[PDB]
Paper text:
Here we present the crystal structure of the MAM domain of human NRP1 at 2.24 Å resolution. To overcome this issue all residues that are potential substrates for glycosylation were changed to aspartates to exclude heterogeneity while maintaining negatively charged features of the protein region, thus partially mimicking the effect of glycosylation; this protein variant was named a non-glycosylated MAM (ngMAM) domain. The electron density maps allowed model building for residues 639–813 in chain A and 641–815 in chain B while the N-terminal region (residues 628–639), which contains four of the mutated residues that would be glycosylated in the WT protein, as well as the (His)6 C-terminal tag, was disordered. The crystal structure of the MAM domain of NRP1 comprises a variable N-terminal region that contains a short α helix connected through an extensive linker to a single β strand (βA), and an adjacent eight-stranded β barrel organized in a jellyroll topology, with the strands named B-I, followed by the short α-helical turn at the C terminus. In addition to the polypeptide chain, we were also able to identify two Ca2+ ions and a molecule of bicine associated with each of the NRP1 molecules within the asymmetric unit. The two Ca2+ binding sites are present in both MAM domain molecules within the asymmetric unit and stabilize the domain by bridging the residues from the N-terminal variable region to the first and the last strand of the jellyroll. In contrast to the meprin MAM domain (Arolas et al., 2012), which contains five cysteine residues in the MAM domain of NRP1, no intermolecular disulfide bond can be formed as the four cysteine side chains present form intramolecular disulfide bonds, thus eliminating cysteine-dependent oligomerization as a mechanism of NRP1 self-association.
Neuropilins (NRPs) are single-pass transmembrane receptors involved in several signaling pathways that regulate key physiological processes such as vascular morphogenesis and axon guidance. Neuropilin-1 (NRP1) and neuropilin-2 (NRP2) exhibit distinct expression patterns; however, they share a common domain organization and 44% amino acid sequence identity in humans (Kolodkin et al., 1997). They are composed of five extracellular structural domains, named a1, at the N terminus, then a2, b1, b2, and c, followed by a single transmembrane helix and a short cytoplasmic tail. The membrane proximal c domain of NRPs is also called the MAM domain (referred to as such in the rest of the text) based on its sequence homology to the equivalent domains in meprin, A5, and mu-phosphatase (RPTPmu) (Takagi et al., 1991, Beckmann and Bork, 1993). Instead, it was proposed that this domain supports dimerization and multimerization of NRP molecules and thus contributes to the formation of signaling receptor complexes (Nakamura et al., 1998).
Numbering used by the authors:
A (entry chain B): 642 to 815
B (entry chain A): 640 to 813
């Protein structure tokens, strides 16, 4: 199959919500919720209904949640990170992917970003996890929008693919 | 006129036991056909969607024969379109992949516009072909020439017209 890197996450199934080996960042005010949704317009039909969610809420506007991956095995190969996201609504918020390094000190490098409405359906995002001797973790950062309908969903984060490096990158269409 | 791609041209080849060529058709004058496979195991899969794809197996006994899949008519009188697709060609003798434009009757002819021969890499790659503006209408052909390889084959997936790529960006090394 593929090596057990501990990196992938579907966020479980109906009788089991999980963040796998990912962790909530303790430098920010909110965290991502794991939902099981078998109703309404945002669902995980392929994976028995579980995803993470950052609800738009004018009262929480501009606070962030950050989910932080295990350290990426980045030394021999690059990886293509794929994930799915759902950002419907004009004030749904902002989703950023960052690479967190340790060594000058701990700092974040912005590599992917989607601001506001992206469409009324799930979309595929991809980010190349470049080869690097300097070690890093991946961060999914949800910034709460002012809308009062919906929010940012993310699901099915994976490096289990054989996608060429040059074609990996799939930015947000805004 | 302007929504034709989603009427059978754009094709992911279905999902699970829904195996489909959308509105693409087998050329019947030719000996072999492409097959739709469901992603189960092995290194060739539509991993990111858990989806289907098309495949032309290498087989030394059919070396040099072709399977030909023929698109619906492209409406090209008013504009060019960027067609993107994915392909997987691993093995020195995996065969040859050709994209042709078959211009409409009378005075039908086939114009070759994209060809890959032999080993391209152990991973999915993205092809791009600019479907030029033309008064004479045409169909796109995906043509798989059987390699003499004993393992593997040419896989293709996720053919689409993407009108947000400009003509200069409708190209590899990009
Ligand atoms: Ca899921
Ligand atoms: Ca899913
Ligand atoms: Ca597919
Ligand atoms: Ca795919």
């Amino acid at each position: 199959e593929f090596p057990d890197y501990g990196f992938n996450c579907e966020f479980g199934w109906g009788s089991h919500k999980t963040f796998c080996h990912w962790e909530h960042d303790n430098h920010v005010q909110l965290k991502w919720s794991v939902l099981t949704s078998k109703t309404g317009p945002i669902q995980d039909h392929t994976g028995d209904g579980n995803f993470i969610y950052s609800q738009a809420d004018e009262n929480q506007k501009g606070k962030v949640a950050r989910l932080v991956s295990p350290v990426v095995y980045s030394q021999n190969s690059a990886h293509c990170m794929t994930f799915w996201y759902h950002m419907s609504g004009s004030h749904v918020g902002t989703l950023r992917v960052k690479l967190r390094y340790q060594k000058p000190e701990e700092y974040d490098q912005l590599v992917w970003m989607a601001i506001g409405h992206q469409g009324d359906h799930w979309k595929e995002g991809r980010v190349l996890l470049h080869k690097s001797l300097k070690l890093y973790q991946v961060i999914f950062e949800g910034e709460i929008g002012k809308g009062n309908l919906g929010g940012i969903a993310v699901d099915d984060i994976s490096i289990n693919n054989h996608i060429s490096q040059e074609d990996c990158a799939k930015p947000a269409h805004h």
